[PDB]
Amino acid sequence: SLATTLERIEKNFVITDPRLPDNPIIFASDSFLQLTEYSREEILGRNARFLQGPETDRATVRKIRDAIDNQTEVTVQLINYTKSGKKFWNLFHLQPMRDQKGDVQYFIGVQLDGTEHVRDAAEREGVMLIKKTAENIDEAAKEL
């Protein structure tokens, strides 16, 4: 219901705090709630892995895990699930939010949902778009 102005940006994203237990969600956009069918109250303080399910590729999930441990960006495509159990393909991009000194403070994660796995030009376009979305979220947060 009550979203911060950052969470009203009309793209799917969450932001997590790696210094809280289990690197949990501290912001989630209204669009993300509509896509996934979760309420904000039931996902604040929770790690985003609940979006996965039985068909999610574990090698892809380990790639995300390895990037988070490296404190870097990553981009992958994986199967996710709404609260009611409906599958969707998620072209997903993670990137750290750093302070001026370069230290990681938070992670931004952006989701581009589709019914099908994307490849070739469609994949390139989608990767460009989610990267721009993450950059725009970072800029919106930091703006003076």
């Binding site: 009550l2 501290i26 403070q105």
Partner: protein
């Protein structure tokens, strides 16, 4: 608490703290994170954020 409750008061505090204009982004995010970790302290955190906001008024 063994179980954090995100009541109407806390959720409202997220919006109000985030909207304070004289905080920097690090402070806004730190307060939102603190609310997430201890939502029972919403009134106290909101009060502290508002104090900081007035202290950091542009001149």
């Amino acid at each position: 608490s063994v179980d954090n409750k995100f009541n109407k008061e806390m959720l409202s505090a997220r919006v109000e703290i985030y909207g304070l204009p004289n905080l920097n982004w690090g402070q806004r995010f730190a307060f939102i994170s603190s609310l997430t970790d201890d939502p029972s302290q919403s009134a106290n955190l909101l009060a502290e954020a508002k104090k900081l906001n007035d202290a950091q008024a542009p001149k």
